[PDB]
Amino acid sequence: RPEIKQAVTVRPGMCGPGSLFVGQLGDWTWETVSAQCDTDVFAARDASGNPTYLAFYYFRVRGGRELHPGSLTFGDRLTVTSGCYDQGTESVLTLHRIDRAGSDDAQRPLDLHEFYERPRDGSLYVENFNRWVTRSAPGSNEDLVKSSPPGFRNDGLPQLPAAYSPRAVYREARTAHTFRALDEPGFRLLPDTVEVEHPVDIVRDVNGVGLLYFASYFSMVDKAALALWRRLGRSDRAFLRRVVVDQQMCYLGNADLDSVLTLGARVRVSTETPGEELVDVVISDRDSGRVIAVSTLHTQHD
């Protein structure tokens, strides 16, 4: 099928230091899958007739100094190019490239080579690997079950080569609690960590089907990042100037709406380019003994 190109003028509901851009990306992923896989994702049902949610599982937003999510303001003209890749019947990979409108070569199609091996400073690259799930019991957000809706057309979707498997990426992150190997050269682990008790925010972070909202995981990760930033005695003003050039998230689990989660954060500082840091956040559900999320942010600051 054709990739979907769209002209987008940045709206209030898709930018700022919160989770709105990630929220908008997610809506585009469900639109792109519905179009390319001949399925209404929004109203999807399993063969048995139960609601099946195309759940976010691995999420990457890669930018750079020249274009990062914090670059976007009201009225900016963007080019968005979207398309899906075959991951079988139970999962699907969606990519989005975001360029400034009118920018040289913004009409170019998706290029796996570009996304996984030659990402350009000035374009934003979004990877959404999603897994169809159902609840195992009504009103439980635990122990979700793999699924697929009838008529899900992954067939003919372009193929991903072995090298570019998001499954390798997330499997290492669940084991290491980072997406950037602790043995990666030119970085030094600061000793300062934080651990924040976070009750599920029922006012803010519940979605339309009673799960924790996928974009709320980015909010909870930045809550932990702020906690750690303040512990480094740095200013709220400076927090809002942070440049996030890369962010990876794995959604290991969801959680019941009466849960108390734990947000853990650590940081590694560059020993090679000043102000550049790696922040790792782990979200736990202590009462169930589950790690429900891992995130790593590649940041630049002052």
Ligand X SMILES: CC(C(=O)NCCNC(=O)CCNC(=O)[C@H](O)C(C)(C)COP(=O)(O)OP(=O)(O)OC[C@H]1O[C@@H](n2cnc3c(N)ncnc32)[C@H](O)[C@@H]1OP(=O)(O)O)=[N+]([O-])[O-]
Report d(CA 59, CA 248) in Å as an integer. 6
Quote the least distance from Cβ 87 to ligand X, whole Å: 13
* CB contact at 8 A, 216 and 201: yes
Report the DSSP beta bridge partners of residue 197: 262
Report the DSSP beta bridge partners of residue 196: 263
Quote the least distance from Cβ 57 to ligand X, whole Å: 6
Which residues, 100 to 159, sit near ligand X by CB under 6 A? 131, 133, 144, 146
Structural tokens at position 59: 């999420």
State yes or no: residue 106 binds its own copies (CB under 8 A). no
Could you give the count of Cα atoms lying within 13 Å of 224 in the half-sphere of its Cβ? 30
- The one of ligand X, its own copies, none whose footprint includes residue 144, by CB under 5 to 8 A per kind, is ligand X
Which listed residue (48, 73, 175, 273) binds its own copies by CB under 8 A?
73
- The one of its own copies, ligand X, none whose footprint includes residue 122, by CB under 5 to 8 A per kind, is none
Q: CA torsion angle for 98, 100, 101, 105 (degrees, to 10)?
A: -80
Burial (Cβ within 10 Å: 0-12, 13-18, ≥19) of residue 52: buried
Quote the least distance from Cβ 204 to its own copies, whole Å: 5
Q: CA torsion angle for 268, 296, 242, 164 (degrees, to 10)?
A: 120
Quote the least distance from Cβ 202 to its own copies, whole Å: 6
Report d(CA 257, CA 236) in Å as an integer. 29
List the x/- string, 172-211, binding to its own copies by CB under 8 A: ------------------------------xxxxxxxxx-
Residues that bind its own copies in the complex, under the rule CB under 8 A: 9-20, 23-24, 26-27, 30-31, 40, 42-44, 51, 53, 72-76, 202-210, 213-215, 219, 222-223, 226, 236-237, 239-240, 257-258
Residues that bind ligand X in the complex, under the rule CB under 6 A: 12, 26, 53, 55-57, 131, 133, 144, 146, 207, 211, 213-214, 251-254
